[PDB]
Design a protein around this ligand. Structure first.
Ligand SMILES: *[C@@H]1O[C@H](CO)[C@@H](O[C@@H]2O[C@H](CO)[C@@H](O)[C@H](O)[C@H]2NC(C)=O)[C@H](O)[C@H]1NC(C)=O
Ligand SMILES: *[C@@H]1O[C@H](CO)[C@@H](O[C@@H]2O[C@H](CO)[C@@H](O)[C@H](O)[C@H]2NC(C)=O)[C@H](O)[C@H]1NC(C)=O
Ligand SMILES: *[C@@H]1O[C@H](CO)[C@@H](O[C@@H]2O[C@H](CO)[C@@H](O)[C@H](O)[C@H]2NC(C)=O)[C@H](O)[C@H]1NC(C)=O
Ligand SMILES: *[C@@H]1O[C@H](CO)[C@@H](O[C@@H]2O[C@H](CO)[C@@H](O)[C@H](O)[C@H]2NC(C)=O)[C@H](O)[C@H]1NC(C)=O
Ligand SMILES: *[C@@H]1O[C@H](CO)[C@@H](O[C@@H]2O[C@H](CO)[C@@H](O)[C@H](O)[C@H]2NC(C)=O)[C@H](O)[C@H]1NC(C)=O
Ligand SMILES: *[C@@H]1O[C@H](CO)[C@@H](O)[C@H](O)[C@H]1NC(C)=O
Ligand SMILES: *[C@@H]1O[C@H](CO)[C@@H](O)[C@H](O)[C@H]1NC(C)=O
Ligand SMILES: *[C@@H]1O[C@H](CO)[C@@H](O)[C@H](O)[C@H]1NC(C)=O
Lengths: 169, 184, 198
């Protein structure tokens, strides 16, 4: 509880911005997954960009206030963690894919940082299945679209954090 | 469905160097279906007015994740549909199988596993190595790939006739060894 | 007699390795004493670091940057249990980079009194902006002349040394550190030679 996340706010904001800039990069998780699943054909990439999971847009995030924005970021990161856990429990090969664990640790760090930032502003955050797969092509396409949407959402949240740092009202 | 299409079989597990015939059945509104491999055309034969057969000869191993077969229709509904073709390697026979004794209690047998034939998805996971002796009728799945520590029961029996077996979802190889307890 | 409260709790993170922490035990207790290093985030806990020998122990997990972490060591024996004070720091401010490699010295045909430097830095894949310290000397002298540190504060991979004697050989060495001045200075790089133009 009080054993971390000191009262420094500028350092926390800088850490959040740096984590967002580091995570919002296609070479982090999407490109290794594409190069591993043999999806380098232009038609396969078009199918990847076609199927897109519904993520909050940039204008919606910019229109919200600060506590609502933090709560939506928390919920979206929780959903992303759940989806990554499902993908890990469906792939059944941990040693051939450490980028998944790296992204999971990064998302956990971002979640800790946003929780600490919300606690510093005297705001309370909102507190709340089949292993086998019939087809594999549809699963690959869905995972590709989910990773694309996740990277776009990370870029959007990084831009919103940059605008917040520019404002500093 | 008049606006959909199907393809069989789905997620087929084959051996490197075999043949396969993939069938494709589209609806009534779909027209001029053209299937492709990773990057190459495929000359399909029309078995009927609404069916099309794809023939592949001497498939080659590409990766442990399978070869994606994407098939896109030029006319009608513009989308991409297809299946993954899982190709596995050939299972080899254990080479230089020999065992030894140290204190008349354990037998540390060792061998060569060969080439790995394990896929990544839920298709093919296990590659078991079973060692069953004849005079005792004992065999359990070993937890290692190229080693095993045998436990001999008391009785001062000096004879052995083993039969190591490697089995996967496709084939099953076997090799027999014969030795003596005091001579090793 | 029971042990005392440990002090001098510091931690260093080498580039490409886990976090290593050290402390001083104090006095000899003449009894079997175990030292366990605790570690946790603000919302998550990590496995314990049990010292197998001496005072330093290397953690088992991967270091995560941009997240404050709090660590402390507890001393326990057959007569008492006492834990030291906890420190709150950032794993990115305790990194010790590796010395730059592939140092090359190139001359210039137009200006014989200059020597352009060229090196490459790891920087954890382009994550840390590193400032460098360049020292140069002749081949017969033993003392090293250091360039003003204010001139090498911006992140860069090349530097042009001026005011040098024409037709003379020189030796160079470099070491890098974080831009914010925090962390630890890296070891000296490999000595690279270079001859000025006529
Ligand atoms: C895969 O298809 C090829 C080509 O259709 C076939 O190869 C035949 O193999 C037999 C046995 O060696 C020969 O007698 C034939 O002449 C080959 N050609 C044909 C057209 O039958 C066979 O069906 C398959 N080959 C393998 C190696 O599996
Ligand atoms: C190879 O070894 C595995 C692991 O011991 C075993 O797989 C078992 O298969 C049976 C029948 O399908 C299942 O009821 C068990 O749950 C599986 N696991 C275990 C631990 O027994 C089996 O001995 C071998 N499987 C194959 C396909 O060869
Ligand atoms: C020693 O082990 C071998 C291999 O496991 C076995 O030899 C079999 O002997 C029977 C009896 O004649 C034959 O019908 C089989 O064809 C042999 N081979 C196999 C693979 O079963 C048998 O267990 C032992 N052989 C002897 C001579 O004792
Ligand atoms: C294996 O060891 C056993 C005992 O150490 C021996 O087996 C003998 O084999 C001969 C040949 O048939 C028999 O006449 C004997 O009765 C067996 N027992 C003994 C105690 O001599 C032999 O040293 C080895 N087996 C073989 C076939 O060489
Ligand atoms: C506290 O004890 C530590 C012992 O770890 C010392 O700090 C550094 O320790 C390393 C290795 O033991 C030495 O190489 C350094 O010279 C020590 N000093 C510094 C400034 O790094 C030292 O005895 C104590 N540190 C302080 C700051 O009092
Ligand atoms: C004996 O085993 C070794 C493996 O270490 C290898 O040389 C080979 O499989 C065997 N030797 C021969 C000559 O086949
Ligand atoms: C200390 O660690 C040892 C293992 O090295 C263990 O046997 C012992 O129980 C621990 N506790 C004490 C008080 O020695
Ligand atoms: C550094 O030099 C070595 C050989 O001197 C060689 O690997 C290459 O030229 C350089 N490596 C990198 C990563 O720049």
């Amino acid at each position: 509880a009080n054993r971390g996340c000191s009262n420094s706010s500028s350092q926390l904001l800088s850490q959040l911005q740096n984590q967002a800039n580091l995570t919002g990069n296609t070479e982090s998780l999407l490109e290794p997954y594409i190069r591993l699943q043999n999806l380098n054909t232009p038609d396969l990439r078009a199918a990847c960009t076609q199927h897109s999971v519904a993520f909050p847009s940039e204008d919606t995030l910019r229109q919200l206030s600060k506590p609502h924005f933090l709560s939506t970021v928390y919920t979206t990161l929780d959903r992303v963690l759940y989806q990554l856990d499902a993908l890990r429990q469906k792939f059944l090969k941990t040693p051939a894919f450490p980028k998944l664990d790296s992204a999971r640790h990064n998302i956990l760090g971002i979640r800790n940082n946003v929780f600490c930032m919300a606690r510093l502003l005297n705001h309370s955050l909102e507190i709340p299945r089949s292993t086998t797969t019939p087809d594999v092509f549809n699963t690959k396409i869905g995972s590709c679209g989910f990773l694309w949407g996740y990277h776009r959402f990370m870029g959007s949240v990084g831009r919103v954090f940059r605008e917040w740092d520019d404002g500093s009202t | 469905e008049p606006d959909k299409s199907l393809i069989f079989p789905k997620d087929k597990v084959l051996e490197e160097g075999s043949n396969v015939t993939i069938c494709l059945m589209y609806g009534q509104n779909v027209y001029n279906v053209s299937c492709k491999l990773q990057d190459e055309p495929i000359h399909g034969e029309q078995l009927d007015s609404h069916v099309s057969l794809l023939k592949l000869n001497n498939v080659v191993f590409l990766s442990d994740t399978g070869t994606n077969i994407n098939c896109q229709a030029t006319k009608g509904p513009k989308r991409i549909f297809g299946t993954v073709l899982f190709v596995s390697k050939v299972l080899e026979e254990p080479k230089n199988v020999s065992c030894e004794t140290r204190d008349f209690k354990t037998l540390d047998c060792s061998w060569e596993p060969g080439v790995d034939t394990t896929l990544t998805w839920r298709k093919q996971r296990f590659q078991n190595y079973t060692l069953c002796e004849s005079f005792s009728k004992r065999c359990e799945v070993s937890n290692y790939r190229n080693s095993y520590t045998w436990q001999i029961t008391e009785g001062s029996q000096e004879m052995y006739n083993f039969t190591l077996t490697a089995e996967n979802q496709l084939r099953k190889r076997s090799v027999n060894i014969n030795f003596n307890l005091t001579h090793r | 007699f029971p042990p005392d409260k440990p002090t001098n709790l510091t931690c260093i993170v080498n580039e490409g390795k886990n976090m290593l922490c050290q402390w001083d035990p104090g006095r000899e207790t003449y009894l079997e004493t175990n030292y366990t290093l605790k570690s946790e985030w603000a919302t998550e806990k990590f496995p314990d670091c049990q010292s197998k020998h001496g005072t330093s122990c290397m953690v088992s997990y991967m270091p995560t940057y941009y997240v404050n972490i709090e660590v402390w060591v507890e001393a326990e024996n057959a007569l008492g249990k006492v834990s030291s004070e906890s420190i709150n720091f950032d794993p990115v401010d305790k990194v010790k980079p590796t010395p730059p490699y592939n140092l090359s010295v190139t001359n210039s045909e137009e200006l014989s009194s200059i020597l352009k430097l060229s090196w490459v830095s790891s920087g954890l894949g382009g994550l840390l902006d590193l400032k460098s310290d360049i020292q140069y000397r002749t081949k017969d002298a033993s003392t090293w002349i250091q360039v003003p540190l204010e001139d090498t504060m911006s992140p860069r991979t090349s530097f042009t040394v001026q005011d040098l004697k024409p037709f003379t050989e020189y030796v160079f060495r470099i070491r890098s550190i974080k831009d914010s001045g925090k962390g630890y200075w890296s070891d000296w790089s490999e000595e690279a030679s270079g001859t000025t133009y006529e």
